[model samples]
Target: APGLQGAPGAPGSQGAPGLQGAPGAPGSQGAPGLQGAPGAPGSQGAPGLQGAPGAPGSQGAPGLQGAP
Candidate 1:
């Protein structure tokens, strides 16, 4: 006659609190554009049509006297 009995073990359960990090939302502030009033003085160029009359035998012509 023979007989034997054994084994029994269990234990592990407890973990909840490590997931709440989502605070990233802030970027929109830029207003600067108002200083434009000084660009209307570049339209005064209308007087260029009178300078081309000085080039005819350039100062040296006096020799024509023969007698025979």
Candidate 2:
């Protein structure tokens, strides 16, 4: 009971894959974890059927009619 042991209570709804931990020796930049409140707008993806009109770009050689 020295001074460092109080962080292990957050696992009751996301379990299924944990077996790969052996490479962590560079910690010095961790203070930005509090942005999870924007998930309610994902149900409108059905309007993509109009892409076939690109073949009329060859008429740029008639610029000599300035005398009227």
Candidate 3:
């Protein structure tokens, strides 16, 4: 039994023949979660009130006189 199980599970333990048996290569990093916590009655936005009318525009300066 000296050389019977000497290299039986040796290749699987090593990372040279490409056969991830027990411990696989280091690479389980995944992207961040997109959807956040789920809730009810969310995003309750209402329309704002109408603004007041603006002031009357003044007459502009001109060479000729205004409405006589």
Worst 10 residues of 3 by lDDT: 1-10
Residue lDDT tens for model 3, 13-65: 76656556788567676656866656555545654666978889888765786
Q: What C-alpha lDDT, on a 0 to 100 scale, does residue 24 get in candidate 1? A: 70
RMSD per model, one decimal: 13.8, 25.0, 15.0
Q: Total clashes, candidate 2? A: 0
Best by TM-score: 1
Mark the regions of model 3 whose C-alpha exceeds 4 Å error after superposition.
1-22, 35-47, 53-68
The reply for model 2, stretches above 4 Å from the true place, is: 1-44, 62-68
lDDT of 1 by residue, 1-68 (tens): 67766543432343555676795767766554656665657756666868989787666658866894
For model 3, state the Cα shift of residue 3 in Å: 28
The alpha-carbon deviation from the true structure for residue 49 of candidate 2, after best TM-score superposition, in angstroms, is: 4.3
- Between prediction 2 and prediction 3, the one with superior TM-score is 3
lDDT of each: 0.63, 0.72, 0.66
- Cα lDDT for residue 66, candidate 3: 71
Best by lDDT: 2
8: Cα error in model 3, Å: 21
